């Protein structure tokens, strides 16, 4: 019959990338199993939720290589709950056996005849480090949307400039970019948002490669391998919508900002856009939001400079948070006028990062 | 004006005592409020959920002592995200001011005129120390249920035993025990469920004291008073239904008995009562489930003696965990036959702790 012997940890760290992905519940059957696939080097486990596949090798020792289905959180938490460190696996008849010490789990397998040949193409198209894309698609993801008009805006374009690469992420108003390093020369991609969440669990230090497919991407790291959909079209012109013509700098640090908008947005309206009020004035930020339940004020002390010494603008509190959120350190904000978009980054756009944010009207 | 210091760390422990206790929404205007009364000495912050009062104190140095009315969760939340350690609190008409360092909050104050007068009796009547009183509920409280046909099983019975008390909980088949030290005498009480736990979030080591008062009891430590129900009737003899004819004890630890019984209890069917098999022969126990997924069995090494050297008995998982919780270090288990009730304790019964568990059809 069919035995595995497996490192616990290892086993582990696969079955948790997969069930992240692989349905609970499903009226289809099949939908909610794991496929695993035994060779001589080790175990393959994959599955999909229909908008990505996703495969992860586990090295092991196998005879008699074999493969089967079983549901698959029930077998993470199986595995997750065993005692000790290796885990044997063993197959007779529609019964996978689970064995570490004195515990011994057997499961019913299901129709693996009925489920669908996941295929992952290998040709190597482009590589970069998946650590660097992992952080840039985390540091520009809250910006699309999935209710945008636009189809485009939905996903995260991927752009490629030989020495780096850049995402871009919008709803037409505000934007997140972030630029890295890049083994560069490849095409434009406009990646789902919902999949680049997928991506971003399963991305590690590292090289990770590219196989482009029709209306479809393969991203390949280190024992895991993705099919996801790509968005045809192209992304819309986003520098046409960041401002040029600044007219007043203002300099802080980052984690007392942060803070400062989080604390007065509890007073903003339930709904009224969240609307914060920021107010620079004589080395000073003062930031205010008011509501039916009172009116805030925090003031911190910045560095300002340009063509403006004082300006007042009206911003939607969460939009700042999630605009902030990958600046460390010291922001620096670069206003273009009372009611007309912003940037916000770090010191000199240092790391790669910018975000453009619109004004309340 | 009214003007008021106090720490922000010490503000903060109050206001979360209370906001635990008050509710956040209620088509009651008022019953979401806090009332803070406050004198020379600091700030009494007060609140009701209807089935409990609760009062506590906060040192703080105070001017023109006056007292108000504020949004509890609103208030508990501003004050948790202030940036300094030092809090300074002013009234001006309905405007409560909240400032520390570069922040300066306004709350609008409510109606304090039509806000319930809260009253906390002081007679000590009897001397309890609250960590032992604690430690005694948390061991007894998921024994007892709401949903008991007998309305004082909805409760914790509290007995007075000269130097020493009791705390008994039950749904009429399983009973939890356990014994702890009391200084001086007192009247037998039945606690609701839900006024424990309450009891048990704001008890520390150290004397809280009962004041007795007609069908409720205030409890007062060194930060809180706390007014509750009682339930009438006389809590059941429970002792019936403790076995006193032990055939089979085991003894193994307490936490590997925990996660073999967690584990195992994963292949249960879904609803025939969390089933897990207790098999013990030859210095083991087994332990093993089965439902429609699959079928699990754990064994475990175990000393073991009585008159029959071998048994089969099935339990609710569920319970069982619920019953070795409070269980360091080894775990006895008492059985008096396949399907009649088994006592679970730590060795000895040290510690003053005993569970009483029923069996499975």
Redesign the interface.
């Given at each position: 019959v069919m035995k595995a012997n497996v490192t616990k940890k290892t086993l582990n760290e696969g079955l948790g990338l997969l069930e992240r992905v692989i349905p609970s519940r499903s009226s289809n059957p099949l939908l909610t199993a794991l496929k695993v696939e035994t060779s001589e080097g080790g175990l393959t486990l994959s599955g999909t939720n229909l908008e990505i596949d996703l495969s992860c090798f586990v090295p092991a020792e196998v005879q008699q290589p074999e493969n089967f289905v079983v549901?698959a959180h029930?077998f993470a938490?199986?595995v997750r709950?065993?005692?000790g460190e290796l885990v044997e696996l063993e197959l007779s008849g529609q019964?996978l056996s689970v064995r570490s010490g004195?515990?011994?789990?057997?499961?019913?397998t299901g129709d693996i005849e009925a489920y669908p040949p996941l295929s992952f193409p290998a040709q190597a198209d482009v590589s970069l480090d998946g650590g660097e894309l992992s952080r840039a698609f985390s540091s520009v993801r809250y910006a699309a949307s999935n209710e945008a008009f636009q189809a485009v805006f939905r996903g995260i374009k991927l752009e490629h400039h030989g020495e780096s690469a850049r995402v871009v992420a919008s709803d037409g108003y505000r934007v997140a970019i972030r630029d890295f390093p890049a083994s560069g020369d490849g095409k434009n991609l406009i990646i789902p948002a919902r999949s680049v969440d997928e991506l971003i669990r399963v991305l590690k230090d590292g090289e990770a490669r590219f196989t482009y497919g029709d209306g479809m991407l393969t991203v390949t790291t280190d024992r895991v391998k993705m099919n996801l959909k790509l968005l045809d079209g192209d992304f819309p012109d986003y520098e046409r919508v960041i401002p040029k013509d600044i007219k007043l700098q203002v300099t802080l640090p980052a984690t007392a900002l942060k803070?400062?908008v989080?604390?007065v947005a509890?007073?903003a309206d339930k709904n009224a856009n969240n609307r914060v009020e920021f107010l620079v004035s004589e080395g000073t930020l003062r930031l205010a939001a008011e509501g039916d339940?009172?009116?805030?004020?925090?003031?911190?002390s910045v560095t300002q400079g340009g063509t403006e010494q004082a300006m007042s603008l009206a911003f939607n509190a969460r939009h700042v948070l999630d605009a902030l959120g990958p600046i460390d350190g010291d922001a620096e904000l670069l206003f273009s006028g009372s009611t007309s978009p912003a940037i916000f980054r770090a010191v000199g756009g240092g790391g790669g990062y910018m975000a453009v944010m619109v004004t309340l009207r």
């Amino acid at each position: 019959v069919m035995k595995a012997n497996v490192t616990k940890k290892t086993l582990n760290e696969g079955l948790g990338l997969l069930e992240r992905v692989i349905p609970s519940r499903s009226s289809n059957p099949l939908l909610t199993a794991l496929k695993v696939e035994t060779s001589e080097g080790g175990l393959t486990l994959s599955g999909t939720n229909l908008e990505i596949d996703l495969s992860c090798f586990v090295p092991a020792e196998v005879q008699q290589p074999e493969n089967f289905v079983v549901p698959a959180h029930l077998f993470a938490q199986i595995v997750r709950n065993l005692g000790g460190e290796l885990v044997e696996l063993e197959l007779s008849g529609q019964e996978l056996s689970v064995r570490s010490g004195g515990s011994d789990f057997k499961l019913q397998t299901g129709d693996i005849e009925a489920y669908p040949p996941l295929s992952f193409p290998a040709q190597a198209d482009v590589s970069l480090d998946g650590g660097e894309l992992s952080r840039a698609f985390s540091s520009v993801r809250y910006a699309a949307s999935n209710e945008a008009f636009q189809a485009v805006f939905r996903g995260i374009k991927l752009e490629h400039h030989g020495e780096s690469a850049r995402v871009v992420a919008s709803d037409g108003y505000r934007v997140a970019i972030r630029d890295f390093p890049a083994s560069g020369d490849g095409k434009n991609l406009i990646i789902p948002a919902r999949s680049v969440d997928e991506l971003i669990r399963v991305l590690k230090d590292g090289e990770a490669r590219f196989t482009y497919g029709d209306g479809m991407l393969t991203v390949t790291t280190d024992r895991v391998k993705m099919n996801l959909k790509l968005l045809d079209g192209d992304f819309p012109d986003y520098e046409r919508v960041i401002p040029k013509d600044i007219k007043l700098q203002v300099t802080l640090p980052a984690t007392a900002l942060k803070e400062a908008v989080n604390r007065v947005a509890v007073l903003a309206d339930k709904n009224a856009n969240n609307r914060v009020e920021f107010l620079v004035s004589e080395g000073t930020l003062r930031l205010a939001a008011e509501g039916d339940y009172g009116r805030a004020q925090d003031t911190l002390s910045v560095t300002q400079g340009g063509t403006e010494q004082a300006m007042s603008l009206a911003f939607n509190a969460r939009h700042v948070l999630d605009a902030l959120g990958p600046i460390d350190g010291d922001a620096e904000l670069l206003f273009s006028g009372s009611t007309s978009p912003a940037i916000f980054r770090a010191v000199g756009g240092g790391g790669g990062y910018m975000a453009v944010m619109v004004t309340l009207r």
